[PDB]
Design a protein around this ligand. Sequence first.
Ligand SMILES: *[C@@H]1O[C@H](CO)[C@@H](O[C@@H]2O[C@H](CO)[C@@H](O[C@@H]3O[C@H](CO[C@H]4O[C@H](CO[C@H]5O[C@H](CO)[C@@H](O)[C@H](O)[C@@H]5O[C@H]5O[C@H](CO)[C@@H](O)[C@H](O)[C@@H]5O)[C@@H](O)[C@H](O)[C@@H]4O)[C@@H](O)[C@H](O[C@H]4O[C@H](CO)[C@@H](O)[C@H](O)[C@@H]4O[C@H]4O[C@H](CO)[C@@H](O)[C@H](O)[C@@H]4O[C@H]4O[C@H](CO)[C@@H](O)[C@H](O)[C@@H]4O)[C@@H]3O)[C@H](O)[C@H]2NC(C)=O)[C@H](O)[C@H]1NC(C)=O
Ligand SMILES: *[C@@H]1O[C@H](CO)[C@@H](O[C@@H]2O[C@H](CO)[C@@H](O[C@@H]3O[C@H](CO[C@H]4O[C@H](CO)[C@@H](O)[C@H](O)[C@@H]4O)[C@@H](O)[C@H](O[C@H]4O[C@H](CO)[C@@H](O)[C@H](O)[C@@H]4O[C@H]4O[C@H](CO)[C@@H](O)[C@H](O)[C@@H]4O[C@H]4O[C@H](CO)[C@@H](O)[C@H](O)[C@@H]4O)[C@@H]3O)[C@H](O)[C@H]2NC(C)=O)[C@H](O)[C@H]1NC(C)=O
Ligand SMILES: *[C@@H]1O[C@H](CO)[C@@H](O[C@@H]2O[C@H](CO)[C@@H](O[C@@H]3O[C@H](CO[C@H]4O[C@H](CO)[C@@H](O)[C@H](O[C@H]5O[C@H](CO)[C@@H](O)[C@H](O)[C@@H]5O)[C@@H]4O)[C@@H](O)[C@H](O[C@H]4O[C@H](CO)[C@@H](O)[C@H](O)[C@@H]4O)[C@@H]3O)[C@H](O)[C@H]2NC(C)=O)[C@H](O)[C@H]1NC(C)=O
Ligand SMILES: *[C@@H]1O[C@H](CO)[C@@H](O[C@@H]2O[C@H](CO)[C@@H](O[C@@H]3O[C@H](CO[C@H]4O[C@H](CO)[C@@H](O)[C@H](O)[C@@H]4O)[C@@H](O)[C@H](O[C@H]4O[C@H](CO)[C@@H](O)[C@H](O)[C@@H]4O)[C@@H]3O)[C@H](O)[C@H]2NC(C)=O)[C@H](O)[C@H]1NC(C)=O
Ligand SMILES: *[C@@H]1O[C@H](CO)[C@@H](O[C@@H]2O[C@H](CO)[C@@H](O[C@@H]3O[C@H](CO)[C@@H](O)[C@H](O[C@H]4O[C@H](CO)[C@@H](O)[C@H](O)[C@@H]4O)[C@@H]3O)[C@H](O)[C@H]2NC(C)=O)[C@H](O)[C@H]1NC(C)=O
Ligand SMILES: *[C@@H]1O[C@H](CO)[C@@H](O[C@@H]2O[C@H](CO)[C@@H](O)[C@H](O)[C@H]2NC(C)=O)[C@H](O)[C@H]1NC(C)=O
Ligand SMILES: *[C@@H]1O[C@H](CO)[C@@H](O[C@@H]2O[C@H](CO)[C@@H](O)[C@H](O)[C@H]2NC(C)=O)[C@H](O)[C@H]1NC(C)=O
Ligand SMILES: *[C@@H]1O[C@H](CO)[C@@H](O[C@@H]2O[C@H](CO)[C@@H](O)[C@H](O)[C@H]2NC(C)=O)[C@H](O)[C@H]1NC(C)=O
Ligand SMILES: *[C@@H]1O[C@H](CO)[C@@H](O[C@@H]2O[C@H](CO)[C@@H](O)[C@H](O)[C@H]2NC(C)=O)[C@H](O)[C@H]1NC(C)=O
Ligand SMILES: *[C@@H]1O[C@H](CO)[C@@H](O[C@@H]2O[C@H](CO)[C@@H](O)[C@H](O)[C@H]2NC(C)=O)[C@H](O)[C@H]1NC(C)=O
Ligand SMILES: *[C@@H]1O[C@H](CO)[C@@H](O[C@@H]2O[C@H](CO)[C@@H](O)[C@H](O)[C@H]2NC(C)=O)[C@H](O)[C@H]1NC(C)=O
Ligand code: NAG
Ligand code: NAG
Ligand code: NAG
Lengths: 211, 231, 452
Amino acid sequence: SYVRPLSVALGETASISCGRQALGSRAVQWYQHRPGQAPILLIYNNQDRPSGIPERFSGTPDINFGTRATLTISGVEAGDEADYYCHMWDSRSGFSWSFGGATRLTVLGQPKAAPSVTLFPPSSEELQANKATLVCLISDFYPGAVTVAWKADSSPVKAGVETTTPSKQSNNKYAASSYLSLTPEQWKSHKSYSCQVTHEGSTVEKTVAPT
Amino acid sequence: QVQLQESGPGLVKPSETLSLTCTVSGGSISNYYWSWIRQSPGKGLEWIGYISDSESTNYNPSLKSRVIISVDTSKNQLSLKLNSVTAADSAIYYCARAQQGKRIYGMVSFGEFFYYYYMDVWGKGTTVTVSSASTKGPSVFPLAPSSSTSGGTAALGCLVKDYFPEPVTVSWNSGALTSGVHTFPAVLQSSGLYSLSSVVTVPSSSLGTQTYICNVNHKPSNTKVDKKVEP
Amino acid sequence: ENLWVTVYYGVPVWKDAETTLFCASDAKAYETEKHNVWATHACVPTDPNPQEIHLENVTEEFNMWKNNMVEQMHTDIISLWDQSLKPCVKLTPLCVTLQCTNVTNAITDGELKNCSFNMTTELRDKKQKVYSLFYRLDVVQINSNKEYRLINCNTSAITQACPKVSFEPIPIHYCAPAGFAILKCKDKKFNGTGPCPSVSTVQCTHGIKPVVSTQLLLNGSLAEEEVMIRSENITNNAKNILVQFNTPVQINCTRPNNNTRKSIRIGPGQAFYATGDIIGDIRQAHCNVSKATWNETLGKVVKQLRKHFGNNTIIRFANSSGGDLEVTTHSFNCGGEFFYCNTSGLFNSTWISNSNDSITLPCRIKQIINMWQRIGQAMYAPPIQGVIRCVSNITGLILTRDGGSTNSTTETFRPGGGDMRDNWRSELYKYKVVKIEPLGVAPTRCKRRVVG
Ligand SMILES: *[C@@H]1O[C@H](CO)[C@@H](O[C@@H]2O[C@H](CO)[C@@H](O[C@@H]3O[C@H](CO[C@H]4O[C@H](CO[C@H]5O[C@H](CO)[C@@H](O)[C@H](O)[C@@H]5O[C@H]5O[C@H](CO)[C@@H](O)[C@H](O)[C@@H]5O)[C@@H](O)[C@H](O)[C@@H]4O)[C@@H](O)[C@H](O[C@H]4O[C@H](CO)[C@@H](O)[C@H](O)[C@@H]4O[C@H]4O[C@H](CO)[C@@H](O)[C@H](O)[C@@H]4O[C@H]4O[C@H](CO)[C@@H](O)[C@H](O)[C@@H]4O)[C@@H]3O)[C@H](O)[C@H]2NC(C)=O)[C@H](O)[C@H]1NC(C)=O
Ligand SMILES: *[C@@H]1O[C@H](CO)[C@@H](O[C@@H]2O[C@H](CO)[C@@H](O[C@@H]3O[C@H](CO[C@H]4O[C@H](CO)[C@@H](O)[C@H](O)[C@@H]4O)[C@@H](O)[C@H](O[C@H]4O[C@H](CO)[C@@H](O)[C@H](O)[C@@H]4O[C@H]4O[C@H](CO)[C@@H](O)[C@H](O)[C@@H]4O[C@H]4O[C@H](CO)[C@@H](O)[C@H](O)[C@@H]4O)[C@@H]3O)[C@H](O)[C@H]2NC(C)=O)[C@H](O)[C@H]1NC(C)=O
Ligand SMILES: *[C@@H]1O[C@H](CO)[C@@H](O[C@@H]2O[C@H](CO)[C@@H](O[C@@H]3O[C@H](CO[C@H]4O[C@H](CO)[C@@H](O)[C@H](O[C@H]5O[C@H](CO)[C@@H](O)[C@H](O)[C@@H]5O)[C@@H]4O)[C@@H](O)[C@H](O[C@H]4O[C@H](CO)[C@@H](O)[C@H](O)[C@@H]4O)[C@@H]3O)[C@H](O)[C@H]2NC(C)=O)[C@H](O)[C@H]1NC(C)=O
Ligand SMILES: *[C@@H]1O[C@H](CO)[C@@H](O[C@@H]2O[C@H](CO)[C@@H](O[C@@H]3O[C@H](CO[C@H]4O[C@H](CO)[C@@H](O)[C@H](O)[C@@H]4O)[C@@H](O)[C@H](O[C@H]4O[C@H](CO)[C@@H](O)[C@H](O)[C@@H]4O)[C@@H]3O)[C@H](O)[C@H]2NC(C)=O)[C@H](O)[C@H]1NC(C)=O
Ligand SMILES: *[C@@H]1O[C@H](CO)[C@@H](O[C@@H]2O[C@H](CO)[C@@H](O[C@@H]3O[C@H](CO)[C@@H](O)[C@H](O[C@H]4O[C@H](CO)[C@@H](O)[C@H](O)[C@@H]4O)[C@@H]3O)[C@H](O)[C@H]2NC(C)=O)[C@H](O)[C@H]1NC(C)=O
Ligand SMILES: *[C@@H]1O[C@H](CO)[C@@H](O[C@@H]2O[C@H](CO)[C@@H](O)[C@H](O)[C@H]2NC(C)=O)[C@H](O)[C@H]1NC(C)=O
Ligand SMILES: *[C@@H]1O[C@H](CO)[C@@H](O[C@@H]2O[C@H](CO)[C@@H](O)[C@H](O)[C@H]2NC(C)=O)[C@H](O)[C@H]1NC(C)=O
Ligand SMILES: *[C@@H]1O[C@H](CO)[C@@H](O[C@@H]2O[C@H](CO)[C@@H](O)[C@H](O)[C@H]2NC(C)=O)[C@H](O)[C@H]1NC(C)=O
Ligand SMILES: *[C@@H]1O[C@H](CO)[C@@H](O[C@@H]2O[C@H](CO)[C@@H](O)[C@H](O)[C@H]2NC(C)=O)[C@H](O)[C@H]1NC(C)=O
Ligand SMILES: *[C@@H]1O[C@H](CO)[C@@H](O[C@@H]2O[C@H](CO)[C@@H](O)[C@H](O)[C@H]2NC(C)=O)[C@H](O)[C@H]1NC(C)=O
Ligand SMILES: *[C@@H]1O[C@H](CO)[C@@H](O[C@@H]2O[C@H](CO)[C@@H](O)[C@H](O)[C@H]2NC(C)=O)[C@H](O)[C@H]1NC(C)=O
Ligand SMILES: *[C@@H]1O[C@H](CO)[C@@H](O)[C@H](O)[C@H]1NC(C)=O
Ligand SMILES: *[C@@H]1O[C@H](CO)[C@@H](O)[C@H](O)[C@H]1NC(C)=O
Ligand SMILES: *[C@@H]1O[C@H](CO)[C@@H](O)[C@H](O)[C@H]1NC(C)=O
């Protein structure tokens, strides 16, 4: 149905159990999948890793029955964090079409990174189009949990606010963006507009004003 | 040494036939197997079917009634066709090269061997949305530099107003500038159209003028838009 | 010139006699596991050293086919089987209707069946629904889910072999009482019947293992020098053919399935041993036989075969074609499970003009058995835990001709097992029972002291 969570300290090895354990002799495939990217198989046969894969990942051979297919990751790092699927093929069960239930690997103890916020006022060409959007961009922040509150002056806006859920980038840090839709007349009326981003206990505020 | 390229519409009306094409450049289609996998948001990835080198199909029982897989001999491409699609059929679609393995736990003559498959090479993946809503070309507005941190450093960007559907590809100077680029994921507004932003971090000494232009492409809209950005 | 009769007591004189023999076997404490049916609680221990006394000049006629030691041993095995079955649990309530499904596999192959059924508990009023694993041969269908019954329930009652007793054959020495003796033919080239030039006398036979077998003979004794062909009459097709090897072939039989035993209580004291679910792969039982050695042994057989069929003639081998399933397959017991093997791969040959590659034989398994053509009380062999693997010497064979055909054109040999006694004859061919008549009267020139 849905994903099972796993948490590991940074730099410490981890074992990933496989659901629907086999009834007879089995050949298991371990796939590494990142959301939005192409899945990479780490182990096609239970021992066996394709070329290019680091030696840190390993799986159990079923030399003697009774062993449980697990995925061992040594030197756990940020890049290891991901979703891992366990494709099972045993002799007793028939054709196994579905992959295993996903396993969300999270790496604990990662160093937190302050968010880099950049607020952009609406373009003049957008104002000619009779529309206005304030664009608040947040990059390179971990852990990926932020709250965005918009202010005009003192006042909060609370309307026309649309924010993306944070998404991981190649930096292994998260990235989120917030859009405040406004009418050009409302943009000209107020003195300045402020984007407030709260990350953990800290809070960063950026301000922009009409020309 | 094998490359897979997924090409398709990216948007299909509900209750219509979806088609996709997966071109292979590394090797002949008739030596290895091929398979289709789809990844829908909020769910695990799903194996839907595979095709053999000798052109023998086999489908997942859940979708068996609606899926047809084909492979072309003249072109190293394999096609996927899905009938009576709905909003759930919309997902990221991957085609992958599957190799066959034989696992023997007893003696072969009586049986006691089962075949297993595994996909070593994957394509980048094409996204497909299913909705009655029409296509909407993007509106590109430049984001002027604030003039931001005591230098080097300053930031500019491009805004892609509401469009449909995903994805939008963004390059800068036709791929000439790669450093400092960061294209954020789009937001689905209550309007029903996505909106994204793309920023570049450059030194204020670079200004000016370095003549920074951003290029935006929307495959469903059939429109390619280039916009100049300046203070 | 005057001759008088004189009495001599203890003269070496004997006559052919049939008497009641008794058992003898060396004592193994076996304090851990006990009570194999043949050794019983007791069988008389063997003498520390047996005495085999050669008889110079003595030539005695033997007939292995008119031997009574065979019939005695036959009735002894049968009676021993019944004596060991009496105290064990009889499965009269196990004839409930069974709802059975196949054991899980991808359906590329599957004999064995998963059977659920009701069963009386210990309290008379309460009932339990339990499940057991049954091989296909033990059960037959009547009508739905599907519905099944045990094959025996319409022919006879059934009783479960006690788990402690072992079916392993141990050597049993047949001994004659005082006043009788056993004569042993030591002729290497000895035909089945006829005058034996080299004869010795013994009080007890050698250690004979009562191996219950069909087709090929197992764990027997090997003839020295040439292999031996023994029949009651060679030219008669109806009479079987006994073959004894000089070199033993090796045969390995394994049941790879890693079975489990489930003890379900079916009454006060009573306990049925159901077959639990298999652990691991589903593999069927088999036996390999080295193709090279079996080709050599088959070659030596046909060399001795042609000595009775012409120096040149077509001698071919075919599979069994007569009778029910229990006579068509090489039936035997290994570790407590009863194996039944397709032997067609061993007897598919034709002989004319004078890698490892081990042959493999498929073997099915039955848990309900009626050996020695027994109609009536059947036996349920309890399941054996773990994987089974036994190595056996195959020392002999039992063959049969096809009979009516155009003579001397081609000769065809198929394996048969018409009777179980032929297995006893294969090891009793050399022994014979006689009674000592120690009273001899002869004339000498000796007279007793006159009364007058
Ligand atoms: C009576 O007589 C009959 C007839 O002789 C006899 O029948 C035999 O019974 C045996 C068991 O009783 C049975 O044995 C098993 O045999 C399996 C097959 O062995 C052969 O093939 C394999 C594979 O060959 C492939 O792949 C190799 C590896 O890359 C490759 O080099 C070859 O080129 C070949 O590829 C080619 O052919 C493929 C088709 O198979 C094709 O797909 C390819 O495209 C290519 O064309 C060889 O490795 C052997 O050398 C033999 O040649 C064997 O696979 C199996 O054991 C495994 O399973 C056991 C239990 O399930 C485990 O306990 C054991 O450890 C093995 O598991 C290991 O390997 C598997 C798969 O490789 C892996 O999934 C596991 O994780 C585990 O890996 C670990 O060990 C391996 C190596 O051992 C290491 O590499 C890893 O790093 C891990 O450490 C059993 O060995 C036999 O099949 C059967 N024979 C026949 C012909 O019937 C019967 O036994 C006799 N019985 C009596 C009466 O005594
Ligand atoms: C032709 O001749 C050949 C050669 O003689 C025959 O081959 C023989 O084949 C036999 C199989 O049918 C085989 O017998 C068995 O061998 C098994 C393997 O032995 C291994 O271990 C020994 C060490 O002990 C090694 O030396 C050897 O090399 C092997 O590695 C044994 O495991 C078997 O033991 C059991 O079964 C018999 C009868 O069923 C019992 O009498 C015996 O006590 C064993 O049973 C107990 O233990 C098992 C263990 O799981 C339990 O499952 C079972 O319930 C029993 O446990 C209960 O009882 C004990 C004792 O009271 C108690 O402690 C416990 O708590 C429980 O209550 C068995 O011995 C022969 O070894 C093999 N011959 C040779 C020389 O190896 C061939 O069959 C012949 N052909 C024909 C047609 O007959
Ligand atoms: C089984 O059946 C066979 C055949 O029927 C029996 O063999 C016969 O045994 C009888 C009695 O033992 C033999 O009769 C006697 O023969 C001896 C031998 O003659 C001597 O001279 C030979 C010529 O030089 C010489 O080669 C012989 O060598 C043999 O014998 C000695 C042992 O004595 C041995 O050590 C050597 O190696 C040789 O093998 C031998 O020296 C002969 O001497 C006898 O005469 C004497 O004995 C009688 C009493 O028996 C006495 O009355 C005389 O006055 C004289 O003193 C006697 O003739 C017969 O030859 C054997 N062979 C036949 C009949 O063909 C055998 O005994 C049976 N055994 C059993 C267990 O039933
Ligand atoms: C012959 O036929 C019999 C039926 O009479 C089979 O016996 C059944 O075997 C199945 C196995 O497929 C058993 O089903 C399993 O039951 C387990 C019992 O649950 C216990 O644990 C829960 C807590 O989780 C307790 O609340 C409960 O009281 C029990 O103590 C389940 O745990 C199993 O669930 C697992 O498998 C499912 C499969 O979809 C997964 O989705 C789950 O996540 C989990 O991994 C499972 O449901 C059944 O109970 C057996 N019945 C009986 C009467 O024995 C034999 O197996 C069959 N044999 C052959 C050879 O065919
Ligand atoms: C057929 O299947 C049965 C299962 O029903 C199987 O019996 C099992 O064998 C295993 C052996 O692998 C037993 O497991 C052992 O149990 C003992 C009991 O305490 C433990 O001490 C053992 O621990 C050792 O092995 C570990 C392996 O990781 C080591 O890490 C450890 O340090 C010890 O050295 C071990 O766990 C199991 O108890 C039995 N179960 C039963 C019910 O008998 C049988 O072996 C199978 N046979 C075949 C031929 O496949
Ligand atoms: C168990 O397996 C047997 C095969 O050994 C199945 O028997 C078959 O049943 C189908 C009915 O769907 C018939 O068409 C076939 O002819 C049967 N084959 C044989 C060899 O008899 C049986 O249906 C299976 N039962 C279950 C419950 O799975
Ligand atoms: C007992 O039941 C068996 C079935 O298990 C009967 O065997 C059948 O006998 C008939 C003869 O009328 C044959 O045509 C069938 O082929 C037999 N079936 C099998 C599976 O062997 C047997 O006749 C029954 N005996 C009695 C006395 O009722
Ligand atoms: C075993 O060999 C003996 C020879 O000692 C056979 O006995 C002879 O058999 C032939 C015919 O086969 C008869 O003509 C002779 O009269 C028999 N001789 C004696 C002394 O009885 C015996 O038949 C052979 N047995 C088999 C089964 O071939
Ligand atoms: C039956 O099994 C025995 C042993 O389990 C086999 O004997 C082995 O033969 C191989 C040669 O292939 C030798 O390397 C081993 O050393 C032997 N083992 C022993 C204990 O001597 C025998 O070959 C098997 N026979 C068949 C027909 O399968
Ligand atoms: C024993 O094996 C032989 C050959 O392996 C089996 O003969 C086969 O019989 C089936 C019909 O039952 C035919 O379709 C096959 O063509 C036969 N094989 C050959 C090679 O001719 C025989 O049936 C087996 N015995 C049992 C009881 O299954
Ligand atoms: C199985 O047969 C073999 C013959 O290959 C037997 O091994 C021989 O045993 C006898 C004693 O009975 C020795 O004189 C031989 O030297 C042995 N042969 C070899 C090659 O060493 C083996 O004992 C038999 N196993 C049984 C009867 O259980
Ligand atoms: C078990 O007994 C019940 C009676 O309570 C019956 O309804 C059911 O069909 C029985 N099940 C089988 C497999 O015979
Ligand atoms: C030997 O067998 C043949 C059958 O071919 C038979 O006619 C003959 O009477 C038999 N001879 C004896 C003495 O039994
Ligand atoms: C004997 O072999 C024939 C093939 O000639 C086959 O049809 C038959 O089933 C076999 N019988 C046995 C009992 O193996």
